[PDB]
Amino acid sequence: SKDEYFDGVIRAGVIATTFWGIVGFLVAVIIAFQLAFPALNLEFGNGMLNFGRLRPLHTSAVIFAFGGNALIASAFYVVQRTSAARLFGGTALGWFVFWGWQLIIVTAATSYLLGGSQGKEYAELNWHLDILVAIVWVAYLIAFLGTIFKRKEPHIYVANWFYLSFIVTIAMLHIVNNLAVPVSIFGTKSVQLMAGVQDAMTQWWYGHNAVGFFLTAGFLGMMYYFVPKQAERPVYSYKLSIVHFWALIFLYIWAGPHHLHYTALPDWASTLGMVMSVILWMPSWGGMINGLMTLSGAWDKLRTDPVIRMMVVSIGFYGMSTFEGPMMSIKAVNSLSHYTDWTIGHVHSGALGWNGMITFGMLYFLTPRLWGRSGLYSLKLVSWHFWLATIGIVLYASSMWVSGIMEGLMWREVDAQGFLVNGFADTVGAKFPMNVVRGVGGVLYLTGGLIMAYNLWATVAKQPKTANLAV
Amino acid sequence: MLVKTHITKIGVTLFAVALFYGFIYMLSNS
Amino acid sequence: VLEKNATLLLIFAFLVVTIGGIVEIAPLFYLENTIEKVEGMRPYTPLELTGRDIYIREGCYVCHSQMIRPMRDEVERYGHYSLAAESMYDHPFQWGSKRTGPDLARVGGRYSDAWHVEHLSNPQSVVPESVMPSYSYLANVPLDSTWIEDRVSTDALVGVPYSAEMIAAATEMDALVAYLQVLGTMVDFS
Amino acid sequence: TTGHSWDGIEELNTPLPRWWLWTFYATIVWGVAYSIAMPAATPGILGSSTRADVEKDIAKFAEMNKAVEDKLVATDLTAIAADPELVTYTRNAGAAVFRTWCAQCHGAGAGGNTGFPSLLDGDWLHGGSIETIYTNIKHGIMPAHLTDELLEPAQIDDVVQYVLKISGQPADEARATAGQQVFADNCVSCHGEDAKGMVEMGAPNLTDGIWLYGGDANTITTTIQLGRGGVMPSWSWAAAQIRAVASYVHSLGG
Amino acid sequence: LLMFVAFFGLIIAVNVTMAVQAVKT
Ligand code: HEC
Ligand code: HEC
Ligand code: HEC
Ligand code: HEC
Ligand code: HEC
Ligand SMILES: [Cu+2]
């Protein structure tokens, strides 16, 4: 039997997705405030709040915990339905992935503030945690790929192409970038296998591809399932799906050196990164086109359905960032952009605008269904959430652009006499209003997250036994 | 739709000129 | 097609995804420019190595870059643009990604130890406008150096030229200052 | 539309958008062009282009502003402070250079703080002359009496009180007699008697007015106990600029 | 809806502007 879809894990992951979203974004707001007012840092005593330590916590919680859980819930729901079979690992393998993932985030929460970090971005957790994550991910791929193997229909939905790719590539990236000799039990009590330029390359190959697969590909899978899930029928382009997918999947791995522009990294590598990052523009947009064009005719729905609003706007930000990224990947542009708040602007445009928004919409869609509910408790709240999230994202982006341009310019600016026009401190001071506005925008987005939490909770209350009949 | 592509053309000059101003101000700052 | 075939799709994906990594990462292992240390350079002294770990633990990297780009203005501000050879020993590499604070790569003497102590103790005190967090605990905690030998041994395994003699021979604030003082020094003296 | 449905979802067989195609192809073409043009070429740079552009940037900068610096170098530091052409451009830019390099220790104002000298004022530890200031800048930069058996716990207190009297007048009679005697013995050698101080040593005058230095009895006790040990790092490596800065610092007082 | 389209076009215009300015430079 077991004809019914295993909703179990998806339910757990969805709720946790909301929870981690709140935790991660709140850390985001707090650290932002710390940039605005350093007092928020403990003056005497490292303690609980210190920016250097908290920052990676924000990073990991937001990406792996929030984004990660979103990916788990979405992939488990989506693959099951798209292929029409009950999850291959079942409660056992899949639930293991749930608890295991939970353990991973919990360990991050304890470990990071404690000070144990490799110092490698998006890599920060210590080796023991790395082994745990590798194990959980291995289990996760078996469940997912197994689900595909067990499918009913002969064809495999493109959404699964993206999810599947994301799964495999992240595993490879994680293993490779994490090679390190353990000196001690924890924290970064390991030293990376590589050093210098090589370490930088491995790091950014890993680092970009992280957003590339974890944040883009996997989420593209989400978009592929959820955007078309609507009352309106067909409008899409399958051939684009094919071109866009392969081209993206191939091209994206080359993008690593754009991080490294005008650094110690050899010129040839930097160039390869730039060129491929520019080629990357097309496939990435292919995703957005495929998503948006699908809406055509359907647009009237946008006023009606806020979940749709979220998905659509999500693609808008996605395209924007996928455009801005290639531009910043040009050496001349990077010359200005690098080390400035602009990089952050770019990150949150994609993070809040693309990743968060699509996952949000995804959850609003799925959680009622998984919960054995016709719909969310209040649509109005989804709308309010939509607005809060949108203004917050835009405010964040605007502030960062102003700050970033100001910083790059101020840093580079030379006088008539040839001397440096501004002290670094002057640039720092210039940045303050930007820091505050950013703090506010992020705060608003966070509030939207709270509204989501309230709404979801209300809906969650309704029924025990929410097997949703056959499905 | 014509409304869609039109409102697509709308505003483009706005950000275009805003950012060209931004870049003149930038090369003016650096 | 290959739409239908799970194994084929998986294999092609793994293959497609691999090319960039093989093309970019692998050749670097082989290239000498990125491998060769500056001639003068030696590995971090045990105090400096410990301090570097502290710099890692604290999260200094999150605000401070250690990579000078080859532009005139940054050369003017920071000093000689960073060279691959400088980072040869760095497991893991410290190059920044963000400059909330200024670039640290070449503070090969720029400030006195005393200044560093006061500043780390309370950045606002020395630099009123600073965003930097206060790190007074550094003064509070002493180093046991139990682990230092293990750390150097591991680094040697990794290729760092520590002598047996170096291992045998080997406050946190002291270590951090020691680390900061070495940065970028290797190139200038050599 | 295509025949197979994936739970609700069906997909249209549609063509790639022409513009999308064009952009994709264009990017590819640009990439090939870039690679041929970059490392694998472009004209303008002999050999092969690289980060080598750095040299060009510096070189053109040098051509453009070499004259200004070169003119200044011939001129003496005193002259470079006076003259608003070089001299005034030397204060604003020297002042420009000052902010970037010196401000973090000596204050944006150049007024200084505890542990760092006030460059604006009249008082100079190493000497106010142009040569002295220049030397301070170019080549860069107090004995622990607590230990020297004789000084001890009490001797230090006494000497501190006496110095505060040289600087002004507090009231502590034991802390005065003893201190006078000690100062004449030891301190006076570097700080002189009546604390004129000696510029050669960088020993500051004890007969000063209220400055930023820890005048308090306790602070004086600490400096006497433990001694000083302050450094002015050399700008000869890091820094022409040193000269303009000397001209600026000199201009600062007057 | 039309507001989202307007914002999207605005972003695209900002982008083309950035390209021009970088070629300036
Ligand atoms: C922190 C590491 C400093 C740097 C950066 C700069 N200065 Fe400095 N300077 C510093 C100290 C602690 C002292 C006092 C040293 C002592 O005798 O205890 C000084 C002294 C000077 C002087 C001499 C002043 C005098 O009384 O004769 C000069 C002229 C001076 N400093 C100039 C100067 C310039 C131009 C700087 C930027 C290039 C600069 N200093 C940086 C501490 C520090
Ligand atoms: C984020 C906020 C940080 C944190 C995590 C660190 N620093 Fe910094 N730092 C920051 C700013 C905004 C500034 C400029 C203002 C100031 O000088 O106080 C600095 C400065 C420094 C400097 C001086 C650099 C120079 O002027 O050449 C040093 C040496 C420095 N910071 C060191 C340092 C260390 C060791 C850190 C980890 C404990 C650290 N910083 C963290 C902002 C931030
Ligand atoms: C020989 C060298 C001596 C000896 C024998 C004494 N002093 Fe000290 N002193 C000396 C120098 C070069 C400096 C400057 C230190 C620095 O700038 O880092 C000082 C400084 C002091 C100060 C501090 C002045 C201030 O607050 O800025 C004091 C209070 C002082 N010296 C006192 C002092 C006393 C009481 C001595 C006899 C016990 C004495 N000095 C001897 C150089 C030298
Ligand atoms: C991926 C999802 C994601 C979400 C959602 C997110 N962030 Fe972040 N955040 C990141 C990443 C990635 C970085 C690291 C950027 C870097 O290393 O350049 C970061 C870094 C930051 C920083 C450090 C900035 C600096 O200059 O060092 C702040 C502040 C911040 N985020 C605030 C926020 C706020 C406020 C929110 C409010 C919702 C938020 N974040 C939500 C991903 C996210
Ligand atoms: C989350 C959504 C997201 C999307 C979508 C995205 N990136 Fe980024 N981008 C990031 C993050 C996170 C960083 C910061 C990495 C770091 O910490 O240095 C970044 C930084 C960058 C930088 C600046 C690196 C530096 O330090 O100067 C470039 C260039 C870049 N990305 C290119 C791209 C390209 C090319 C694409 C797609 C074609 C893209 N981005 C899409 C998240 C994203
Ligand atoms: Cu990247």
Residue numbers in the entry:
A (entry chain n): 57 to 527
B (entry chain Y): 1 to 30
C (entry chain o): 9 to 178, 215 to 234
D (entry chain p): 13 to 52, 60 to 160, 174 to 271, 281 to 295
E (entry chain h): 11 to 35
Wording from the paper:
The bipartite SC preparations (fraction A-1) were supplemented with either purified full-length cyt cy or its soluble variant lacking the TMH (i.e., cyt S-cy)32 to yield the bipartite SC + cy and SC + S-cy samples. Following SEC, the elution fractions showed that only the intact cyt cy, but not the cyt S-cy, remained associated with the SC. The cryo-EM analyses of the bipartite SC + cy yielded a map (SC-2A, EMD-22227) at 5.2 Å resolution, with local resolutions ranging from 4.3 to 8.0 Å. A clear difference between the maps SC-2A (bipartite CIII2CIV + cy) and SC-1A (tripartite CIII2CIV) was seen at the interface. The unidentified TMHs were barely visible in SC-1A but highly enhanced in SC-2A, indicating higher occupancy. The observation that only the native cyt cy binds to bipartite SC via its TMH suggested that the TMH next to CcoH TMH (blue in Fig. 2e) corresponds to the membrane anchor of cyt cy. Indeed, landmark densities corresponding to the helix-breaking Gly11 and the correctly spaced bulky side chains of Phe15 and Tyr21 of cyt cy TMH (NH2-xxxGly11xxxPhe15xxxxxTyr21-COOH) were discerned. Thus the TMH close to CcoN TMH9 (blue TMH) is tentatively assigned to the assembly factor CcoH. Moreover, upon addition of cyt cy, the predominant conformation of CIV in the bipartite CIII2CIV + cy (SC-2A) shifted toward that seen in map SC-1A of tripartite SC, with no major class corresponding to SC-1B. This suggested that local interactions between the CcoH and cyt cy TMHs and CIV decreased the interface flexibility of CIII2CIV.
